[PDB]
Amino acid sequence: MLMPKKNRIAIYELLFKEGVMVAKKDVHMPKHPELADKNVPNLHVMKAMQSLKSRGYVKEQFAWRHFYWYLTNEGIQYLRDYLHLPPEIVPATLRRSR
Template structure:
């Protein structure tokens, strides 16, 4: 299928920026996040999948596309992106550490012994 160059470039830019892409299996609508036809998105991703640049997963009438390492190199060359730029899915994010609740000064630690455990009285 012939896809206009401008649409193909927009699709590839969005794929490279996020590293993933989602498309509904409906060829008559506009894509949700990209300003182009959904058919163009699905067919462009189908082409990249056949070349091994994208991994495809289909579930509940949605296509989920994930960029592979070879696909990152291909899109870098196609889009003219420098070597240091990577998709957001490959950027490590810091996980914030939770603060531990502080014990009150002088408060004894809770201790549960078997003496505190009460067995149920059986009748």
């Protein structure tokens, strides 16, 4: 198996809620920081986000040993389906700046 389905949902729900992801390039640290506490390693985050990039559902950037990922409109459509959320929700970013 790549990972338990319990882990895979917890990455996608945090990505859909926040609109962005950040991780360092190191496969050995036992826990990802922040709301990926309650047990998932950052190796599962790197491998999950790679599979989401090759579908076209996230953009990727890299500098000084860190990945950065941004969610995009086709990925919002796919995750709202996969997480079974109501069609009206957009929880991350909405209000126009000045």
